[PDB]
Each structure stands twice: as structure tokens, then as C-alpha cells.
Amino acid sequence: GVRTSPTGEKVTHTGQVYDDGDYRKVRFVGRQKEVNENFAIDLIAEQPVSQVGSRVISCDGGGGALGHPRVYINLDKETKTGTCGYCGLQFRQQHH
Amino acid sequence: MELLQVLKRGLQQVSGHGGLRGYLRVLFRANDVRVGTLVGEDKYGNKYY
Amino acid sequence: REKMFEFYERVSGARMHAAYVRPGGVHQDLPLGLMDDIYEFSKNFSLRIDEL
Amino acid sequence: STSVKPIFSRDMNEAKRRVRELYRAWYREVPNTVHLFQLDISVKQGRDKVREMFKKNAHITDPRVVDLLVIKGKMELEETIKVWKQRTHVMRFFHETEAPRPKDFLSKFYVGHDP
Amino acid sequence: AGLLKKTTGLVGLAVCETPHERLKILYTKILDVLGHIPKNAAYRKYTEQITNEKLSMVKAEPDVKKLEERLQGGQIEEVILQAENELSLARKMIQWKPWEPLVEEPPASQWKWPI
Amino acid sequence: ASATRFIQWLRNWASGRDLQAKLQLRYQEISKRTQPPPKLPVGPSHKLSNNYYCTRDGRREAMPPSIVMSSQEKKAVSPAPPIKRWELSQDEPYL
Amino acid sequence: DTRPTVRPRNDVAHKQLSAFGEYVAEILPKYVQQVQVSCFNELEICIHPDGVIPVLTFLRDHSNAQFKSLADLTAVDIPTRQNRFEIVYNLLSLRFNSRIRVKTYTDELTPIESSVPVYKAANWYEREIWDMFGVFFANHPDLRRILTDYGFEGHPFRKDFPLSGYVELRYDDEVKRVVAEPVELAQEFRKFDLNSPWEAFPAYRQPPE
Amino acid sequence: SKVKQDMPPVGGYGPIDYKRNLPRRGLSGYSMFAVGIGALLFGYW
Amino acid sequence: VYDQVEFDVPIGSRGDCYDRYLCRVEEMRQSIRIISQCLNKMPPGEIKVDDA
Amino acid sequence: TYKYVNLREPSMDMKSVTDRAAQTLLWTELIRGLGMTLSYLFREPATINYPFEKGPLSPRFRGEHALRRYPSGEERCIACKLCEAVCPAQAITIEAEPRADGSRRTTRYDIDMTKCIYCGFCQEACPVDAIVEGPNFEFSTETHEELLYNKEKLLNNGDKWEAEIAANIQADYLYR
Ligand SMILES: CCCCCCCCCCCCCCCCCC(=O)OC[C@H](COP(=O)([O-])OCC[N+](C)(C)C)OC(=O)CCCCCCCCCCCCCCCCC
Ligand SMILES: CCCCCCCCCCCCCCCCCC(=O)OC[C@H](COP(=O)(O)OCCN)OC(=O)CCCCCCCCCCCCCCCCC
Ligand SMILES: CCCCCCCCCCCCCCCCCC(=O)OC[C@H](COP(=O)(O)OCCN)OC(=O)CCCCCCCCCCCCCCCCC
Ligand code: SF4
Ligand code: SF4
Ligand SMILES: [Zn+2]
């Protein structure tokens, strides 16, 4: 999420911000600091975990050829959910 | 006469913009006084023809 | 030339510097309907040269 | 081995003659250069610069290298006489906007890492 | 003999009134110059061979158009110009003496690609 | 295409051509800007068998130059047969 | 030659060029050092630098060559060679619809005779070679820089010349003119090591050192 | 379903003119000079 | 595939700027002639070499 | 096959000589040139009324760059650096590190729009359709610095033009 540093400058999704003594803050005087307010780390975390019945599931990102290369995710571990290395969607095997 | 239709077709552009005030508004904003079919209007007020 | 720039733009996306022809062939197939538009442009171009 | 095709001069004695001939052409040209280009330098500064350029290669003993230096020098002279060069090209020999860089070890030490 | 052409179609290449007589002169002059080249030089053996072949055609075909189809060198005015060039070449091969052995072999890896 | 009959006559006469037949401004005879999706074909190498790459590997068939001569009654030859003379066009020999 | 993706061979032209390569080497043995024909049918004649005027004159005037057009003339810099420069002549014959490549060599200090007497087209190609490589052509009607700026020092197309050079230009308001200063780059050019550590073409494998 | 590329129509395209077309206009030289001379005579009269 | 098309090469006679202008205008006409043949002989298939 | 362009012999009969005499004295072939420009005066001009009308474009148009997201909001870019390696102008600078959730993501994605040649090689090389060239072309600036796009500027461009960008990829991805 977008949060402001004590001096008031916004912090980007990469965690970048200028210190209170950094002369480079002069570039924002009379202008604005461009910051994207839709942090991708928050939005992916809002997606529900998909329940599946097989030990191995495939993700192409949705949209077929408009997604990402099809990869196969192993769901044998019960402690954690299998995560797509491309798009971050999580899958869990039904009742292990 | 096709000549009369031209003059008549030019008098219908005044009425198609809502009168002289509307006709002059589009003559000075856009430098064109054609009348077209309203395809739609967006949320900012732009009207597309 | 402006109309022939659209043929460039409709096969590559750039009006001039297409980067379309590459070692091995071309980059993408002609979009549907382009050859019909080239026929229409070519059908009249001879008259343009006559005026020239 | 050690037998090579010459360019213009077969030995240093012959080569040095071309060096002197080139120096006399540059020496006579500076007054015209300082006039046509409307340079704010004196004829003395220009002729000092020519001398500085010649002494920069006083250690050469290969006649062929000397022949190329004269060849390159004559191309420079031709560019200046015919005013192919502009005022900017003739003043690049003086480095007027380059801040003097340090020479001693301590001054080089304070400003950076370069030798 | 045939009617005289009005133009050769090539700019600056004038029509020749007497193509046969001029060709017989040039080929004969070439064969005389080639007599000064050593008998075993490949330039003499090859150049005399092709010159004799063209000379025979000139002597065995009075029609210019039919002669052109045999020589296969374009217009008959082009064939005359090539005869003039070959004659000039032969006069220069004597001075150069290319039939002599190789002046100097290249360094060990001069024509080695890739490096 | 909106020109009156009189102006069409005037411009056709002043140029000597029938301009209306070949208008340089485009109209509804152009293609639709939305088109049906394509289904492009595949190449000759899209096969499941008899398609080993070493049998169609063009790069690996290139060879180094073949040395004809190296310094490390035979008839005369030319680089190729003399070029055949061009033939005058029958479509329109003279412009 | 039925394979769709492979380039067909023209073995008729390969024989003809090989035959003519021997023909030139037989007529000019004083200068010809090596002849070869590539797999795409391009004939190369490698000569001694002394043979530039004899070889090109023969190839332009001989009735069986008639290479009347100089397609191009250029140099290649190979630092590892004793003679780092390789002067390349690309000739075209309109009579025989053929092409030939003539190659020689030189170094930083050895001149090469100018071919302007043989081809008027070589006037600017030799200026470009001198300007971009520093190869001197003897007896050139007028040799000087053609592409580089006036007063430019060095030869850009040498392999040891840096890509961005040594100097750059800006405008200075103090002297009211354009000045030249040592090059500083806001972003340095990023060198990519693209070579794969696995051999690609066994046919060209050089003998082990 | 089946391949669909950008291709010509089944029968091909119609003929395309390319050759020069400069139509002949005007009157002959004789008529043009006759009209000009007749204008002068009426003007002089 | 230039050997599969038909076109005429314009040739000058004077070697001047007017003959080179006529050659260029006539070459434009021949390009329309080739475009007609390319629009009708266009074959189907892939557009880049099938060698990945 | 060749043809002659200027190899013609004029007729020498008295009617042809008089015709050429009338052309010389009465400027007939110059009057004919006037008639061609008079015809254009009475044709409709080809001008469009910009900015109220726009020149036609196509879905393949290569305009301003944008970074796209998946429908869930996650960034498509996974810091592979294929765009950086293929960019002919070296206009792309990328840095990456594991994100707080362990995802392969970028911390720097800069495009110097003054080095870029708008060639589209980056969107060809992207295996996840992350970096695209959008349809926008009206983005002139009053200062140089505004053309040095960073990651925040590129994500804002993607979020702004996604509606149009997605429809153009939908119209052209079968040709790719
Ligand atoms: C029967 C009794 C016997 C006597 C009867 C005689 C009657 C006929 C009288 C002679 C008619 C002469 C007509 C004038 C000729 C002058 C022109 C000339 O010299 O031609 C040769 C000249 C030159 O022709 P040339 O370049 O081909 O060279 C001629 C000479 N040789 C070929 C040998 C080199 O033509 C021109 O003047 C070119 C015109 C310049 C371009 C001007 C733009 C064109 C404008 C067109 C619109 C004009 C509107 C004018 C009306 C305005 C109204 C206010
Ligand atoms: C020497 C020429 C004599 C005239 C010179 C002086 C002109 C007046 C300039 C000073 C006063 C400013 C008037 C405003 C400029 C005129 C154009 C204009 O602005 O139109 C505005 C008006 C519509 O305003 P509206 O849209 O309702 O309000 C905003 C809603 N969001 O739409 C209107 O136009 C309202 C109608 C009154 C203003 C008309 C302006 C007339 C200008 C001359 C018309 C000439 C047209 C013919 C041209 C020659 C053709 C042969
Ligand atoms: C018929 C139209 C009458 C109205 C025209 C009014 C305009 C006059 C100005 C234009 C000149 C035309 C008048 C000259 C006579 C034309 C008729 C004529 O010459 O007879 C036709 C006859 C056929 O010609 P042909 O046999 O095919 O070849 C020519 C071989 N001598 O040709 C002949 O063989 C006869 C001999 C031809 C040579 C005679 C000399 C002609 C050239 C002298 C200059 C004429 C112009 C002088 C006036 C200049 C001012 C305009
Ligand atoms: S469009 Fe081309 S030049 Fe621009 S960033 Fe992409 S790859 Fe680089
Ligand atoms: S934009 Fe695409 S190609 Fe570039 S680093 Fe990201 S995922 Fe890789
Ligand atoms: Zn996924």
C-alpha cells in the first residue's frame, strides 16, 4: 500500500523514498512525484486460493496465448500453497 | 436545380447545430460546420460524430 | 505517399521504419483486407502519374 | 625484415626537410588565420601554438611516421587556408573551456582515483 | 554489308563507318604487340587465342549485324572499344611483366579467416 | 463525390480525364477496419515424424571457401557465358 | 535442392568461377597469392599489394574479364595480423554478368598505390579508407578526410578506437561558440558478452593450438 | 477451422492500367491560326 | 521472385536529366505492373523460414 | 525486355509542322498545364481537421510504451531482461530483486524515450506481454527530463491505456 514518509514524500512499491536531507528532493518542488497507487503485491494477495483435486496443476495465466508460458505446479506439500512463478496465483489440493 | 440544393443544404447546417449561436460556436471552435450523426458522448463531455 | 505509408503502418505498425523484412522472411503476415486496399490504391495510381 | 616501403622520405635527413617546409607554411599562415577567422588571440599566441604542436613530436626517429605527420599537418593547413574549418575548429587547439586538471600527486589524490 | 546504323544507343559512343576494316587493324596490332611477350606467358597464349578467334569471325562475315551475333560483344562499336582496351592492356603487360614468379609470399596467417 | 454535376463536368473537361471514375479520395470501397480473426498456416517443418533437424539444417551445410590456387593447350575462359542481348519490349517498345 | 528451408546450390556457377580463378592466377602469377570460391559462389583473388594496378587493369581491360564497374572498395581491420588492414575491391562485369573480389593488405605505415587511374570511382572510396582507417594511398589526386569532422583526430573504424570516441561537443556561453571536451557519458554503454561457450559450426573448427 | 490468410479473390483482381495516357485535345494548327487571324481582322476593322 | 514477374526496363538515349526523369516516371508505371502480378500470384503459406 | 523513353522521330508533313508551329506560338502545351491545376481547384481537398479528426491507424501501431498487468492486478513483468538484451538502442535499464513475497519483480524499469527508436522489438521479445508499445503518439513534452520514463511512469501508462491496449492485442495476437 501507498504510505508517506515522515517528511511527507510518498513511498513507491519498490520502497524508494528520499531522506529528509537529500538535495534531490528539490526536483519535486513545484511538481509532483509520480507514484503508482496500485501496488501489485497487495492486489495479488487479494486473489482467492484456488482449490483443485489433482496433485499437479497447470497455469498459463489465463487468456490462452495472451497469458504466460504454461507451467506445472506441484501441490504435494500441505503446509503451503503452490504459487505460479509467473503471475502469483495460488493453488491448493483439496483435502491433501 | 442542384445549385439550389447546395444553398439549401448549407442552410440546414445552421439548423442542425441549433441556430446561429450553435452554428457560430462550432465554426470558431472547430473551424468546421458539418452536421453528423451523434455516435455517443463520453463522461468528460466530448461528443463524437 | 501518405496512403502508401498506411500500407507500411498496417503491416509493421510504423509509417516509415517498418523493420518488417528480416533474414528468414518477414515479421508478420499481411492483415486481412490489406491486399484489397493495395488493389484499390493501384487501380488509380496510373492516373496520378498522368497528371504528373 | 626491416626492409620497408617508404612514403615520401627515404631517411630522416630527407624527412626533416619536409618538416621544416611545413613549419614555414604554418608560420606564414597564422597572421592570415588570426585575421580571416577574427580570432581574439595574437599572432604570437598562434605561432606559439604551432611551435607547441611541432615540439610535441620531436622524439620521432622513424621517417615513415614523420611522413604521415607531415601529411596530416598539410591536411590541417589545407583545411585552415580554405576556411573549411570554422572559428570553433581553430580554437580547439587552445582548450579554453577545460578547467586545468591537477598534475602533482597530492592534487590528483584529493579529487579522484585516476593515476 | 547492310545499312549503316544511325546510333549505337550508348552516349558518347560514335557510330563507326568501317567496322570491319577498323577491327582488322586493331586485332592485327594486338597480335604484333603480343609477339614481344615471352612465348610461354599465359597472357600471350590466351590473348592470342581469343584475338585470333575474333579476327577469324571478322574475316568470315561481311554483314555487321550477323557479325555482332557471332562476337557476342554488343554493338560493333563496343567490340572496337574493347579491342582498343585490350591493345592498351598488352602494351602495359610488357612493362609490368606479370608472368614473372610471385614477388613475395604473404605472412604466415595473412589470409586466415576466422582469426 | 459530393460535387455537383456542373462542377464534375468542369473539372473533367479542364483535365481531359474522367476523374470521377478514379477518385484519389477514399470512400466506402476500402476494407472494414474490423476484420475477422485469421488462422494462419504452418510451415513445412511442422511435422511429427520424418522431421529430424540434421536433415534440414541449412547453417551446418555451409563450408569454408574451396581453395583453387595457393602459393603457400588449355583453353581460355570467362567468368560466365557472355550476357544475352535484351529484346525490345512487345508491350510498348517506344514511349 | 528440394528442402524448403535450405538455400539451393548453383554448381554451374561454382565451376565457372573456379575455372576463371585459375585463369587469372595463370596470367598474373607475379601478384596472385591465393584464389578461392565460397559456397555461395563468390570468387576472391588475394594479391600482393604491389599488384593493385596490374591486377585491376587486367580485370578491367582483358577481353575475357571486362570488369568495367567498381562496385565498392573498403577496408577491414584485423589487429591480430602483422598487416592489420585488408583492402577489398568488389568489381562487376556487365559483359559477363559476373562479380569478382580482389583483396590485398597493408599496415599503418605502408602505402598502397591509388587505383583512381584504373577506376574513377576509387577517388572517394580511398578518401573514406584513409579517413576511417588511416591507410595512405600514394599518388591520390587529393587525399583528405571525407566523413569525419574537421580537425578530428584518430581513425574511427579501427578496432582499437573506442565506440564513443574521446571528445564530444557542446555549446559554451562564455566563449559564444561550440567547444570540444573529453567525453563523459551520463549512461555508459553496456557491454554484453553474447558469445555462447559451445561451438556452433564444426566445419570451420580451426586446428588446435 | 481452416486456414484463413490474406489472399486474392478467387478469380483474381481486375486489370490495372499502367501505360501512359495523354489524350489528344484541341484543334489543328490550321484552325488555330485561322481563328487568331480572323480575330485580328475584326479587331482592325 | 523477380524472375517470375514481367516488366520492361526503361532506357535513355541522351544521358541527360530529361531522359533520367522519363526513366523514373516510366519505372513508376512498371512498378504498378509488377504490383498487379504480385497481388494475383501471392501464394499461401508461412511468412518466415520454418527453422527456429 | 526494355523500352525506349525518348527515342522518337517527329513527323515532317506540312500538317504536323504547322501543329508544332501553333504549339510554339500559341503556348498550347502550357495552356494544357493550366487546365490540370484548374481541375484540382474544384476537387475536394484531402486535408483532415486535426485535432478534431485523426489520421487512420492500425492495431499494430507502435506508440508510447506501457507496462501491463494481469487481470488480477499483478504485474506481468517478471524481470527476465529479454527486452533489455534485444533493445537496439540500449534504451532500457532494468534492476530486479526478490519481492517481499518472493516474486521475481523489478525495482527499476527505465526507458530513455530519447534513445528509443520505437521499433517494437521489446514487445516481440517479452514472453508475458508485459512491455508493449501503445497506440498513443501525442505525448510531446516541454523538457527533456520528462522523456526519461521510470517504472512508475510506465505502470501509469499501462493503467491509463489498458482498455485500448487489450483490445489491440486481441485484434492482432493471432498474427503473432
Ligand atoms: C496570314 C498573314 C501572315 C501574318 C499573320 C500572323 C498572325 C499570327 C501572329 C503571330 C502570333 C504570335 C503569338 C505570340 C507569340 C509570342 C510567344 C513566343 O514567342 O513563343 C515562343 C516562346 C519560346 O518558345 P520555345 O522555348 O519553344 O523556343 C522557340 C524558339 N526555338 C524553338 C528556336 C528555340 O514561347 C514562350 O513565350 C513561352 C511562354 C513563357 C511561359 C508563360 C506562362 C504561360 C502563360 C499562358 C497564359 C497566357 C495568357 C496571355 C493572355 C493574357 C491576357 C491579358
Ligand atoms: C469585423 C467583424 C465584426 C465582428 C467583430 C467583433 C466580434 C466580437 C468579438 C468580441 C466579443 C466576443 C464574442 C465571442 C467570439 C465570437 C465567437 C464565440 O465565442 O461564440 C461563442 C458563442 C457560444 O457560446 P456558448 O457555447 O453558448 O457558451 C459557452 C458554453 N460552454 O457563440 C456565439 O458566437 C454567440 C453569437 C455572438 C458572437 C458572434 C461573433 C460574430 C463574429 C463575426 C461573424 C462573421 C461570420 C461570417 C464570416 C465571413 C463569411 C463571409
Ligand atoms: C489551308 C489552311 C488555310 C488557313 C490557314 C491560315 C493560317 C496561315 C498560317 C499557317 C500556315 C498555313 C498556310 C501555308 C499553306 C498550308 C497548306 C499547304 O501547305 O499545302 C498542303 C501541302 C501538303 O503538305 P505535304 O505534301 O504533306 O508536305 C509538305 C511538302 N512540302 O503542303 C505542301 O506540300 C505545299 C508546300 C508546303 C511548303 C510551303 C511553305 C509553308 C511554310 C511557309 C510559312 C507559312 C506561315 C507563314 C505565316 C506566318 C504567320 C502565321
Ligand atoms: S521500441 Fe525498440 S528501441 Fe524502443 S525500447 Fe523497445 S526495443 Fe528499445
Ligand atoms: S518487460 Fe517483458 S521482456 Fe522486459 S524484463 Fe519484463 S518480462 Fe522480461
Ligand atoms: Zn500463472
Best substitution site from J110, J123, J131, J133 to test ligand 5's pocket, by max atoms within 8 Å of Cβ?
Answer: J131
Of G19, E12, C19, G120, give the one whose Cα is nearest residue J119. Answer: C19
Q: Which of E7, E11, E13, E75 to mutate: most I Cβ within 10 Å?
A: E11
Q: Can you list the alpha helix ranges (DSSP code H) found in chain I?
A: 17-41
Pairing, β A90-93 against β A50-52 = parallel
Residues contacting E76, CB < 8 A, separation 6+: E16, E19, E23, E64, E67, E68
| Type and span of the H or E element at F57 | none
Q: Which chains touch I (3 or more CB pairs under 8 A)?
A: C, E, F, G, H, J
- For B47, nearest residue in chain J (alpha carbons): J52
Angle between helices E64-71 and E19-33 (to 10 degrees): 40
Of G59, F76, G26, G98, give the one whose Cα is nearest residue E54. Answer: F76
Output the nine-digit C-alpha cell for E17. Answer: 563507318
Residue F22: other Cβ atoms inside 10 A: 15
Contact residues on chain E for F76, CB-CB shorter than 8 A: 46, 49-50
Planar angle of CA G52, G53, G55, nearest 5 degrees: 70
Phi and psi, residue I43, nearest 5°: -95, 170
Structural contact between residues J129 and J68, judged by C-beta atoms closer than 8 angstroms: yes
Residues contacting H17, CB < 8 A, separation 6+: C43, C46, C47
Output the nine-digit C-alpha cell for G54. Answer: 596490374
User: Coil, strand or helix: which one is G18?
Assistant: helix
| Type and span of the H or E element at A84 | none
Cα–Cα distance for residue pair I47/D41, rounded to 1 Å: 66
Q: What is the largest distance, in Å, between two alpha-carbon atoms of chain H? A: 87
Please tell me if the CB atom of residue J98 comes closer than 6 angstroms to any atom of ligand 4. no
Residue D96 per-residue DSSP state: T
The residue type found at F78 is S
User: Coil, strand or helix: which one is A18?
Assistant: coil
For ligand 3, what atom is nearest to the CA of residue H29?
A: 10
Please tell me if the CB atom of residue H37 comes closer than 6 angstroms to any atom of ligand 1. yes
Q: Can you list the alpha helix ranges (DSSP code H) found in C1-52?
A: 2-12, 34-51
Experimental determination technique: cryo-EM
Taking the CA of residue G179 and the nearest CA in chain J, the distance in Å comes to: 22
Contact residues on chain F for B2, CB-CB shorter than 8 A: 4-6
Residue whose Cα lies nearest atom 39 of ligand 2: it is B24
Is J68 annotated among the ligand-binding residues?
no
Chains A and C in direct contact, meaning 3 or more beta-carbon pairs closer than 8 angstroms: no
Cα–Cα distance for residue pair F74/E40, rounded to 1 Å: 12
Q: Ligand 1 centre from I14 Cα, in Å?
A: 27
Structural contact between residues G75 and G83, judged by C-beta atoms closer than 8 angstroms: no
Of J152, J160, J106, J100, give the one whose Cα is nearest residue J135. Answer: J160
CB within 8 Å: J5 and I23: yes
Taking the CA of residue A43 and the nearest CA in chain J, the distance in Å comes to: 5
| Type and span of the H or E element at D55 | helix D43-55
Q: Please state the length of chain A.
A: 96
Planar angle of CA J167, J171, J176, nearest 5 degrees: 120
Phi and psi, residue J89, nearest 5°: -95, -5
Residue D35: other Cβ atoms inside 10 A: 10
Please tell me if the CB atom of residue J87 comes closer than 6 angstroms to any atom of ligand 4. yes
Structural contact between residues E50 and F76, judged by C-beta atoms closer than 8 angstroms: yes
Q: Which chains touch G (3 or more CB pairs under 8 A)?
A: D, E, F, I, J
Contact residues on chain I for C33, CB-CB shorter than 8 A: none
Structural contact between residues J92 and J111, judged by C-beta atoms closer than 8 angstroms: yes
Structural contact between residues I51 and F45, judged by C-beta atoms closer than 8 angstroms: yes
Taking the CA of residue H19 and the nearest CA in chain I, the distance in Å comes to: 7
Output the nine-digit C-alpha cell for J128. Answer: 508475458
Contact residues on chain I for F41, CB-CB shorter than 8 A: 44-46
| Domains in chain D, number | 1
Structural contact between residues I49 and C27, judged by C-beta atoms closer than 8 angstroms: no
User: Coil, strand or helix: which one is G99?
Assistant: strand
Cα–Cα distance for residue pair E16/E24, rounded to 1 Å: 13
Of C3, C9, H19, give the one whose Cα is nearest residue I28. Answer: H19
Cα–Cα distance for residue pair J122/J130, rounded to 1 Å: 9
Cα–Cα distance for residue pair D31/I11, rounded to 1 Å: 56
Find residue C21's DSSP bridge partners: C26
Of G168, G85, G79, G170, give the one whose Cα is nearest residue G132. Answer: G85
Contact residues on chain F for H4, CB-CB shorter than 8 A: 36-40
Structural contact between residues J158 and J68, judged by C-beta atoms closer than 8 angstroms: yes
Residue whose Cα lies nearest atom 21 of ligand 2: it is B25
Output the nine-digit C-alpha cell for C38. Answer: 493495395
Please list, residue by residue across D4-20, b when 16 or more beta carbons sit within 10 angstroms of its beta carbon and e when fewer do. Answer: eebbbbeeeeebeebbe
The residue type found at F45 is S
Contact residues on chain J for A46, CB-CB shorter than 8 A: 72-73
Cα–Cα distance for residue pair J103/A39, rounded to 1 Å: 13
Residues contacting I26, CB < 8 A, separation 6+: F95, H20, I10, J3, J5
Residue whose Cα lies nearest atom 23 of ligand 3: it is J14
Cα–Cα distance for residue pair F85/G94, rounded to 1 Å: 11
Structural contact between residues A1 and A39, judged by C-beta atoms closer than 8 angstroms: yes
Of G187, G189, G192, nearest to J85 by CB-CB distance is G192
Pairing, β G137-138 against β G112-113 = parallel
CB within 8 Å: G35 and F78: no
Structural contact between residues E79 and E8, judged by C-beta atoms closer than 8 angstroms: no
Of D78, D57, F35, give the one whose Cα is nearest residue J170. Answer: F35
Q: Ligand 3 centre from E6 Cα, in Å?
A: 30
Contact residues on chain G for I43, CB-CB shorter than 8 A: none
Pocket of ligand 5 (CB under 6 A): J 77-83, 94, 125-126, 128, 130-131
Q: Relative to the alpha carbon of J65, which ligand is closest?
A: 4
Cα–Cα distance for residue pair A75/A49, rounded to 1 Å: 12
Cα–Cα distance for residue pair J42/J31, rounded to 1 Å: 17
Identify the domain containing residue D11 by its residue range: 1-115
Residue G153 per-residue DSSP state: -
Of F39, I45, I40, J133, give the one whose Cα is nearest residue C32. Answer: F39
Q: Which residue has the cell 489472399?
A: H7
Q: Which chains touch H (3 or more CB pairs under 8 A)?
A: C, F, I, J
- For B31, nearest residue in chain J (alpha carbons): J49
Q: Which residue has the cell 531522506?
A: A19
Residues contacting D103, CB < 8 A, separation 6+: none
Output the nine-digit C-alpha cell for H22. Answer: 495523354
Q: Ligand 2 centre from B12 Cα, in Å?
A: 19
Angle between helices G11-27 and G52-61 (to 10 degrees): 120
Pairing, β G43-47 against β G98-106 = parallel
Structural contact between residues F1 and F23, judged by C-beta atoms closer than 8 angstroms: yes
Is J87 annotated among the ligand-binding residues?
yes
Taking the CA of residue J175 and the nearest CA in chain I, the distance in Å comes to: 11
CB within 8 Å: C49 and I28: yes
* F26/C contact by beta carbon, under 8 A: yes
Angle between helices C2-12 and C34-51 (to 10 degrees): 160
Please list, residue by residue across E59-94, b when 16 or more beta carbons sit within 10 angstroms of its beta carbon and e when fewer do. Answer: eebeebeebbeebebbbbbbbbbbbebbbebbeebe
Report the first-to-last Cα separation within chain J, whole angstroms: 40
CB within 8 Å: G187 and J112: yes
Of D90, D77, D87, D84, give the one whose Cα is nearest residue D29. Answer: D77
For ligand 5, what atom is nearest to the CA of residue J79?
A: 5
For ligand 4, what atom is nearest to the CA of residue J62?
A: 1
Residue C12: other Cβ atoms inside 10 A: 23
Structural contact between residues J133 and J118, judged by C-beta atoms closer than 8 angstroms: yes
Cα–Cα distance for residue pair G161/A52, rounded to 1 Å: 62
